[PDB]
Amino acid sequence: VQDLTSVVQTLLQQMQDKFQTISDQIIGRIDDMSSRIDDLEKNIA
Amino acid sequence: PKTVQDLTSVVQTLLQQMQDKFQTISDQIIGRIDDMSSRIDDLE
Amino acid sequence: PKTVQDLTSVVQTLLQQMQDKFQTISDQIIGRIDDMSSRIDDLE
Amino acid sequence: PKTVQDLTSVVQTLLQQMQDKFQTISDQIIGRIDDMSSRIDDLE
Amino acid sequence: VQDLTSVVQTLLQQMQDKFQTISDQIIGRIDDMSSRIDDLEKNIA
Amino acid sequence: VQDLTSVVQTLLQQMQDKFQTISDQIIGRIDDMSSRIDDLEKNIA
């Protein structure tokens, strides 16, 4: 009954964690790329 | 605006209304047995 | 640690316990009919 | 190829077959009461 | 009964909106980064 | 009964495929951007 509500709560909370995992992974890469771009623009300037 | 809770108050309502439907049928059956028990009463 | 399976063993338990509840009520009804059939027996 | 609809035609089938199972048991009970009502008939 | 189908439809439509939100957020950043990279390559060239 | 478990398994497996689709799409873009940044840093250097 409530064991329903949690088994749904879990299945969904795992699917979103996986989502976060790939995302956080991506944003980290973009953050490092932006860092490099900043320096590139700074250098030529 | 809906969370898991909401989902489990739908599933709880469903099951309730489904128990309601069957206890209702059992009640009508019990009603029939009661009348039969009165006739048997008035026979013994 | 839960997969879809888990979800369908909750839904299966729910439905079971709900069949259990109604067969139980039917059994008590059948019990009542049995006593009435004995009185009728002892009347015929 | 499945959407929410699909999910709610499974849940609707489940509940149906579960109502079918209990009305069936009620019917057999009603059947028993009918025979008892005939014996009582043939006693009064 | 149908109130089931919607409560599932919603819980899922919220989880995907959150997904879109982070994504659209990310693609926007990449789009601006590509813009800068284009200019960097154009300049040195 | 099991037809439940699959209809849930599917609805969820589609929502994650869509997720992957956008992601794989994004990572590919970042991978090409990193490639260009590498070359930009290599050139000025």
Side-chain angles (χ1 to χ4, degrees):
Chain A
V1 159
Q2 89 195 188
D3 327 74
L4 223 198
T5 190
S6 298
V7 179
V8 175
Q9 206 174 57
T10 304
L11 287 179
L12 289 178
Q13 246 174 185
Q14 310 185 318
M15 179 174 203
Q16 187 194 62
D17 284 317
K18 186 179 176 301
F19 162 43
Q20 289 306 311
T21 295
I22 299 182
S23 302
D24 288 307
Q25 196 189 77
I26 287 175
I27 300 181
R29 292 187 68 190
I30 305 173
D31 289 315
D32 191 13
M33 293 178 70
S34 303
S35 186
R36 307 170 67 182
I37 303 174
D38 285 343
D39 291 357
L40 278 170
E41 307 178 318
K42 290 184 171 197
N43 235 226
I44 69 179
Chain B
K2 261 140 186 182
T3 167
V4 192
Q5 290 169 304
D6 274 63
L7 177 66
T8 62
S9 310
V10 168
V11 178
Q12 186 169 53
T13 283
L14 292 179
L15 277 279
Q16 155 245 166
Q17 307 192 312
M18 252 258 120
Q19 203 183 84
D20 285 5
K21 159 111 179 181
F22 301 140
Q23 180 58 62
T24 297
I25 298 180
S26 289
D27 287 359
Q28 313 179 326
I29 290 187
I30 295 165
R32 293 181 64 58
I33 297 181
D34 284 314
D35 301 327
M36 267 189 42
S37 191
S38 189
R39 283 162 53 182
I40 297 179
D41 274 1
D42 308 336
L43 273 185
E44 301 159 298
Chain C
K2 261 140 186 182
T3 167
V4 192
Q5 290 169 304
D6 274 63
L7 177 66
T8 62
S9 310
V10 168
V11 178
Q12 186 169 53
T13 283
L14 292 179
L15 277 279
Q16 155 245 166
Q17 307 192 312
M18 252 258 120
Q19 203 183 84
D20 285 5
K21 159 111 179 181
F22 301 140
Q23 180 58 62
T24 297
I25 298 180
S26 289
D27 287 359
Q28 313 179 326
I29 290 187
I30 295 165
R32 293 181 64 58
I33 297 181
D34 284 314
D35 301 327
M36 267 189 42
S37 191
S38 189
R39 283 162 53 182
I40 297 179
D41 274 1
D42 308 336
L43 273 185
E44 301 159 298
Chain D
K2 261 140 186 182
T3 167
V4 192
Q5 290 169 304
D6 274 63
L7 177 66
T8 62
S9 310
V10 168
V11 178
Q12 186 169 53
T13 283
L14 292 179
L15 277 279
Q16 155 245 166
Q17 307 192 312
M18 252 258 120
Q19 203 183 84
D20 285 5
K21 159 111 179 181
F22 301 140
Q23 180 58 62
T24 297
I25 298 180
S26 289
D27 287 359
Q28 313 179 326
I29 290 187
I30 295 165
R32 293 181 64 58
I33 297 181
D34 284 314
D35 301 327
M36 267 189 42
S37 191
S38 189
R39 283 162 53 182
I40 297 179
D41 274 1
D42 308 336
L43 273 185
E44 301 159 298
Chain E
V1 159
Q2 89 195 188
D3 327 74
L4 223 198
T5 190
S6 298
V7 179
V8 175
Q9 206 174 57
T10 304
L11 287 179
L12 289 178
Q13 246 174 185
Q14 310 185 318
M15 179 174 203
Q16 187 194 62
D17 284 317
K18 186 179 176 301
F19 162 43
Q20 289 306 311
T21 295
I22 299 182
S23 302
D24 288 307
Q25 196 189 77
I26 287 175
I27 300 181
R29 292 187 68 190
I30 305 173
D31 289 315
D32 191 13
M33 293 178 70
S34 303
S35 186
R36 307 170 67 182
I37 303 174
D38 285 343
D39 291 357
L40 278 170
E41 307 178 318
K42 290 184 171 197
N43 235 226
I44 69 179
Chain F
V1 159
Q2 89 195 188
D3 327 74
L4 223 198
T5 190
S6 298
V7 179
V8 175
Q9 206 174 57
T10 304
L11 287 179
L12 289 178
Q13 246 174 185
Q14 310 185 318
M15 179 174 203
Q16 187 194 62
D17 284 317
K18 186 179 176 301
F19 162 43
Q20 289 306 311
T21 295
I22 299 182
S23 302
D24 288 307
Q25 196 189 77
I26 287 175
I27 300 181
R29 292 187 68 190
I30 305 173
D31 289 315
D32 191 13
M33 293 178 70
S34 303
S35 186
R36 307 170 67 182
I37 303 174
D38 285 343
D39 291 357
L40 278 170
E41 307 178 318
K42 290 184 171 197
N43 235 226
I44 69 179

